[PDB]
């Protein structure tokens, strides 16, 4: 099976298999029961910017998530990507719905890694910056329902032509290259993400919720992983 590192924004309280009893973050490891949460405000039709960063010599995986003129939510974790991932990987962002639902619209998408190797400077880096989607986004592995170009933005999630969101629908994208997340004889690897999301539903209980997820490269949406499993875990071990 896939090697999932994510960090999600849970809109939806799955109690039955140990979400908090409200919309939170959290950073899952193989796992979709989080190693820790952290409280989140969502704002249901509001704009939000998540930030993820991380580096191999504090080893430590962070994310902060915000709305504009409000307080931000900040969830951390110890944790050796080396110990976890392989070598070389693909990240991408996903999301889900079930009973109930919400738009899962990306608005933009960045991310940078650096590796840097013994051999005096000459790091390696890799940058995308993704402000506007177009269709037929070549540089996009698109799964499920995600779709680009409405709007010039990414919906992960099926949305109909008026603007509703669609229940039972799962959706990710992934960066088309390969990315070198660690080697054996790094001197300091570190990579930052960033995305701006709307997240907007007619439920009072929006659900389920988007992830950034670093996986193996071969990864692929497991079966039946709409709704509580964010389209990322075949179960909720
Ligand atoms: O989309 C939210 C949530 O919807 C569905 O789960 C609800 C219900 O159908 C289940 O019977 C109960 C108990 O297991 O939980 C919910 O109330 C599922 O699609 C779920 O995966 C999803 O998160
Ligand atoms: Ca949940
Ligand atoms: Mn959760």
Same mark, same amino acid.
């Given at each position: =099976?896939? #090697?999932?590192?994510?960090?999600?924004?849970? #809109?939806?309280?799955?109690?039955?298999?140990?979400?908090?009893?409200?919309?939170?973050?959290?950073?899952? *490891? !193989? @796992?979709?029961?989080?190693?820790?949460?952290?409280?989140?405000?969502?704002?249901? %039709?509001?704009? %939000?910017?998540?930030?993820? *960063?991380?580096? /191999?010599?504090?080893?430590?995986?962070?994310? $902060?998530? &915000?709305?504009?003129?409000?307080? /931000?939510?900040?969830?951390?974790?110890?944790?050796?990507? +080396?110990?976890?991932?392989?070598?070389? $990987?693909?990240?991408?962002?996903?999301? /889900?719905?079930?009973?109930?639902?919400? #738009?899962?619209?990306?608005?933009?998408?960045?991310?940078?890694?650096?590796? !840097? @190797?013994?051999?005096?400077?000459? #790091?390696?880096?890799?940058?995308?910056?993704?402000?506007?989607?177009? !269709? +037929?986004?070549?540089?996009?592995?698109?799964?499920? +329902?995600?779709?680009?170009?409405?709007?010039?933005?990414?919906?992960?999630?099926? $949305?109909? @032509?008026?603007?509703?969101?669609? %229940? /039972?629908?799962?959706?990710? =994208?992934?960066?088309?290259?390969?990315?070198?997340?660690?080697?054996?004889?790094?001197?300091?690897?570190?990579?930052?993400?960033?995305?701006?999301?709307?997240? !907007?539903?007619?439920?009072?209980?929006?659900?389920?919720?988007?992830?950034?997820?670093?996986?193996?490269?071969? &990864?692929?949406?497991?079966?039946?992983?709409?709704?509580?499993?964010?389209?990322?875990?075949?179960?909720?071990?």
């Amino acid at each position: =099976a896939d #090697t999932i590192v994510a960090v999600e924004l849970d #809109t939806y309280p799955n109690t039955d298999i140990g979400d908090p009893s409200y919309p939170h973050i959290g950073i899952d *490891i !193989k @796992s979709v029961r989080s190693k820790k949460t952290a409280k989140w405000n969502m704002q249901n %039709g509001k704009v %939000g910017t998540a930030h993820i *960063i991380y580096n /191999s010599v504090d080893k430590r995986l962070s994310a $902060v998530v &915000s709305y504009p003129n409000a307080d /931000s939510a900040t969830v951390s974790y110890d944790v050796d990507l +080396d110990n976890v991932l392989p070598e070389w $990987v693909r990240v991408g962002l996903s999301a /889900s719905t079930g009973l109930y639902k919400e #738009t899962n619209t990306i608005l933009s998408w960045s991310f940078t890694s650096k590796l !840097k @190797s013994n051999s005096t400077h000459e #790091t390696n880096a890799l940058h995308f910056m993704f402000n506007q989607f177009s !269709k +037929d986004q070549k540089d996009l592995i698109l799964q499920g +329902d995600a779709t680009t170009g409405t709007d010039g933005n990414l919906e992960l999630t099926r $949305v109909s @032509s008026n603007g509703s969101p669609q %229940g /039972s629908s799962v959706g990710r =994208a992934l960066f088309y290259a390969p990315v070198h997340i660690w080697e054996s004889s790094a001197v300091v690897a570190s990579f930052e993400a960033t995305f701006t999301f709307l997240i !907007k539903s007619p439920d009072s209980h929006p659900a389920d919720g988007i992830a950034f997820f670093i996986s193996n490269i071969d &990864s692929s949406i497991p079966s039946g992983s709409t709704g509580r499993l964010l389209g990322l875990f075949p179960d909720a071990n």
